[PDB]
């Protein structure tokens, strides 16, 4: 169980002087998604490569999934899985139209639910809970990444979490809680005028999974 964010430990969005669109776009409509697919190739020993066609824009045909280590690559090598995650193009590299991502891989077989499960996200502004909304999934074991994407996306559409220029919120962190043990991700970019999408998305490379029935989600925001 990770301890909660200290004072100062969270990134402040007013100290990011680049355009927030660079963060918005990773949690907007478009994401990588596939059901019951096998890796077709491999570049480095800690990645696997999938043939997944982008239905919406056709920006990609092959997706490189990068993991934190070799043992994660070997577990899911040649096994039929589901893929879900946030992809990037800038500084994405391997070896028709390509894209990169981290983790987001879960076995397909035995992991399917007959009907979608609802997880209730709880949103706090300056310590006070203002609202709740549900996010749906049909997996027994779902990656934290998928649930993060679905929660931020809602927030982007309805709360203007990430806009073109900046955000109405100063800090933000999404907290996941499985029974007793919790962990969190910082929802804001690093300070300065540029935003490294690759480097930010790498936090998902451990492929962390939660149980869809047990897990609790809490987003803590701070206003300006």
């Amino acid at each position: 169980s990770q301890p909660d964010p200290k004072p100062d430990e969270l990134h402040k969005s007013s100290k990011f002087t680049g355009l927030m669109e660079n963060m918005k776009v990773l949690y907007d409509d478009n994401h990588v998604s596939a059901i019951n697919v096998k890796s077709i190739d491999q570049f480095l020993y800690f990645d696997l490569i999938y043939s997944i066609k982008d239905t919406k824009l056709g920006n990609y045909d092959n997706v490189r999934v990068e993991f934190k280590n070799k043992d994660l690559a070997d577990k899911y090598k040649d096994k039929y899985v589901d893929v879900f995650g946030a992809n990037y193009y800038y500084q994405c590299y391997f070896s028709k139209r390509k894209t990169c991502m981290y983790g987001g891989v879960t076995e397909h077989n035995g992991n399917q639910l007959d009907k979608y499960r609802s997880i209730t996200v709880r949103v706090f502004e300056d310590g006070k809970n203002l609202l709740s909304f549900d996010v749906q999934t049909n997996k027994k074991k779902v990656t934290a990444q998928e649930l993060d994407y679905l929660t931020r996306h809602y927030l982007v559409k309805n709360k203007k979490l990430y806009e073109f220029n900046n955000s109405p919120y100063e800090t933000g962190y999404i907290k996941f809680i499985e029974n007793e043990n919790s962990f969190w991700y910082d929802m804001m970019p690093a300070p300065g005028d540029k935003f490294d999408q690759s480097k930010y998305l790498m936090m998902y490379n451990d492929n962390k999974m939660v149980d869809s029935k047990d897990v609790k989600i809490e987003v803590y925001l701070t206003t300006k």
Partner: antibody, heavy 121, light 108 residues
Framework: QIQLVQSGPELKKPGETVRISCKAS????????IQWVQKMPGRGLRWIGW????????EYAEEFKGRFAFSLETSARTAYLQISNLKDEDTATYFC??????????????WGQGTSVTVSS | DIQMTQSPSSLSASLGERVSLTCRAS??????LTWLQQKPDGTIKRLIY???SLDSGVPKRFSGSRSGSDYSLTISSLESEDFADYYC?????????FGGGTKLEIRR
């Protein structure tokens, strides 16, 4: 290097649809979106909206919603604008412009040469 | 919606005159401002970006500055090709909106 080239003039009729293209070259297309602007004869510039080439999410000005639509073909590095129920007031020049938000110096940095649409029966 | 009042709408000048277009925001816009030029030709190019920075391959004589909610474009010494239209534009929030434009014509 970086250049946006638009398609030629169009002479359409009232009620017909038209499709103006804006082909970009000299950069990886997914790094920057494309905006559209209307120039009417003898009057100022008017913002139609833009579209993010990663993600695909469009943003339109209220007065152009419902009849003006943004579309893409990314493998061709090409942005389309489509206008539906053509009207006399749609007669104007249309310009595309690069929205490279990855750098603070890239908003509307490179412009297209413009496309003329004339609506008459 | 952010209204961008651009003044004056017509300006009369001569060769070598220092001139100054002002453009005011009805709401806080914080340096998200850009100046554009449209020639009689029709062609449009960006002049100034982030309110005060000169666009690459636009001559020194062009500059831009801020004074609160008051934004301005300055041309230190007019050449012939400069007698064109000039528009400011805010992209601080949606919809992005254009100033009414200034037309720069020659005195006689």
């Amino acid at each position: 290097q970086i250049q946006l080239v638009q398609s030629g003039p169009e002479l359409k009729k009232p009620g017909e649809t038209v499709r103006i293209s804006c082909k970009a070259s000299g950069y990886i297309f997914t790094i920057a979106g494309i905006q559209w602007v209307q120039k009417m004869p003898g009057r100022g510039l008017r913002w139609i909206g833009w579209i993010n080439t990663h993600s695909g999410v469009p943003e339109y000005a209220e007065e152009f919603k419902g009849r003006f639509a943004f579309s893409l073909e990314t493998s061709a590095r090409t942005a389309y604008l489509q206008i539906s129920n053509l009207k006399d007031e749609d007669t104007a020049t249309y310009f595309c412009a690069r929205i490279y938000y990855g750098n603070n110096g890239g908003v509307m940095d490179y412009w297209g040469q413009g496309t003329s649409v004339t609506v008459s029966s | 919606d952010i209204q961008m009042t651009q003044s004056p709408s017509s300006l009369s000048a001569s060769l070598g005159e220092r001139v100054s277009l002002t453009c005011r925001a009805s709401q806080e816009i914080s340096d998200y401002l850009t100046w554009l030029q449209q020639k009689p030709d029709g062609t449009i190019k960006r002049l100034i970006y982030v309110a005060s920075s000169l666009d690459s391959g636009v001559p020194k004589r062009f500059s831009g500055s801020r004074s609160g909610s008051d934004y301005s474009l300055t041309i230190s010494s007019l050449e012939s090709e400069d007698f064109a239209d000039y528009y400011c534009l805010q992209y601080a929030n949606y919809p992005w909106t254009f100033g009414g434009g200034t037309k720069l014509e020659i005195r006689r």
